[PDB]
Amino acid sequence: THWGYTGHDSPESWGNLSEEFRLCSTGKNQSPVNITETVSGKLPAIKVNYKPSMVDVENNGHTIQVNYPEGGNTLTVNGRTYTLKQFHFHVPSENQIKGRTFPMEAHFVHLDENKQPLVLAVLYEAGKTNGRLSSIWNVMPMTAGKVKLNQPFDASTLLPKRLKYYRFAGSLTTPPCTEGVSWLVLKTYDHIDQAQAEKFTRAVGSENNRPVQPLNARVVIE
Ligand SMILES: NS(=O)(=O)c1nnc(NC(=O)CCc2ccccc2)s1
Numbered sequence: 001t002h003w004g005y006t007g008h009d010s011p012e013s014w015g016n017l018s019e020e021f022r023l024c025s026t027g028k029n030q031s032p033v034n035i036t037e038t039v040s041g042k043l044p045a046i047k048v049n050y051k052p053s054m055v056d057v058e059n060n061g062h063t064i065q066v067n068y069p070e071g072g073n074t075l076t077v078n079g080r081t082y083t084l085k086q087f088h089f090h091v092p093s094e095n096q097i098k099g100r101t102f103p104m105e106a107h108f109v110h111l112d113e114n115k116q117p118l119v120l121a122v123l124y125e126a127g128k129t130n131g132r133l134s135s136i137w138n139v140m141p142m143t144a145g146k147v148k149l150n151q152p153f154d155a156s157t158l159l160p161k162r163l164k165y166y167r168f169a170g171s172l173t174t175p176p177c178t179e180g181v182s183w184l185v186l187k188t189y190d191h192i193d194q195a196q197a198e199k200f201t202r203a204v205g206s207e208n209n210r211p212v213q214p215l216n217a218r219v220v221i222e
């Protein structure tokens with residue numbers, strides 16, 4: 001069922017659009033969030049095992065998505081292994097840090113053996129053109145189709161060597177807004193241009209940022 005960021009489709013209305021989408025408005029542990037009050041804690045370290053892969057690059061009419069047909073790109077945290085399935089973007093960002101919104105956000109979406117979801121988020125500040133993403137921005141389809149394995153990419157490049165993160169629990173930020181999702185947001189920011197963000201926006205057709213949802217009973221760990 002059709003959903004979007006403006007008109008009658010809009011996020012305030014996602015719950016009304018379909019019975020399958022009802023948690024988008026009813027649910028109490030939704031993403032994204034404004035990270036403000038955090039409990040300081042001893043979080044387990046992230047180990048990143050990403051590598052040059054063949055990826056498929058899609059415009060799905062809501063975001064640009066780099067898909068990974070095959071495994072082998074993994075993240076280990078607290079002894080569990082999560083497989084990178086895909087990563088995509090939001091312009092502007094969805095999450096905030098103390099009210100701060102960033103020009104863009106990347107979401108690296110994983111599953112472990114148990115099928116537990118985990119999104120790892122990189123926030124991009126205003127700065128230099130992003131060299132490492134230009135591979136993707138060149139091949140970026142500007143209509144609802146896919147550019148296929150003619151496309152090597154190394155997602156190692158897109159993560160910092162400092163892997164300090166905020167940790168909370170929440171939802172998909174898109175319908176059907178399934179809860180059950182672990183969020184790690186990295187404290188270290190990468191960088192983009194204005195020209196790169198607008199190209200994304202041009203291609204996807206709109207700004208694809210869901211408003212922040214109350215944290216409610218949830219605690220963010222620093
Ligand atoms: N905006 S976002 O970063 O939170 C999203 N990421 N994935 C979305 N939906 C899917 O990936 C389809 C399959 C799926 C469902 C549940 C868990 C993992 C994968 S929304």
Ligand SMILES: [Zn+2]
Nearest residue numbers: 088090107173
């Ligand atoms: Zn996302």
